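Hi L.,

You mentioned the student needs an example of a multi-chain input paired with its predicted structure. This one should do, with 147 residues in total across all chains.
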Amino acid sequence: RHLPYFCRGQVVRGFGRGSKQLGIPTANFPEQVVDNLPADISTGIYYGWASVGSGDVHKMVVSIGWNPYYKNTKKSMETHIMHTFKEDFYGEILNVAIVGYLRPEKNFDSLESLISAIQGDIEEAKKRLELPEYLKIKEDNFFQVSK
Ligand SMILES: Cc1cc2nc3c(=O)[nH]c(=O)nc-3n(C[C@H](O)[C@H](O)[C@H](O)CO)c2cc1C
Ligand SMILES: Nc1ncnc2c1ncn2[C@@H]1O[C@H](COP(=O)(O)OP(=O)(O)O)[C@@H](O)[C@H]1O
Ligand SMILES: [Mg+2]
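Structure written out for the whole complex:
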């Protein structure tokens, strides 16, 4: 319904152990950004395009989940960009276009299944983003203003 969804936010640290440990870093935004997501952007795994500051636009996946830790009933969002960065980018602005949905969140019985699933999401996202309908969003003025 509300795809593509465009948003921008400062990259901020998260809690627990960071998914850098898995070789799959996931960037967070301030809760203000997540809170302004339309209700119809259900939890689950999405894909799209991202850039950092005035950088180039790269493929990405986003996980939207429920936040256990805040009162009311808040969501969480984290983005893994399919690009090798040479340094962290905490405090920079991450620009995202969420363009498609992959699947609901799932319960996994092991880290082995979870990691395999995440890697599979990343591979499927790379393929879907080649479709001309999604490939063009890479060139949206949304991103062209950020350079
Ligand atoms: C693309 C992607 C898909 C994910 N899918 C799930 C999932 O289906 N179930 C889950 O419990 N966690 C999922 N996660 C959460 C992942 O376990 C999380 O990144 C770290 O555990 C904490 O940042 C996913 C993360 C990413 C980046
Ligand atoms: N490909 C990438 N995608 C997302 N973040 C990246 C990427 N490469 C480097 N990073 C850095 O990794 C950080 C996320 O690492 P992570 O271990 O998930 O910790 P946290 O969620 O606590 O910030 C981002 O804020 C960013 O600085
Ligand atoms: Mg993270």
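You could point out the following to them. The CA atoms of residues 17 and 25 lie 11 Å apart. The domain at 1-147 is CATH 2.40.30.30 (Elongation Factor Tu (Ef-tu); domain 3).

Best wishes,
N.
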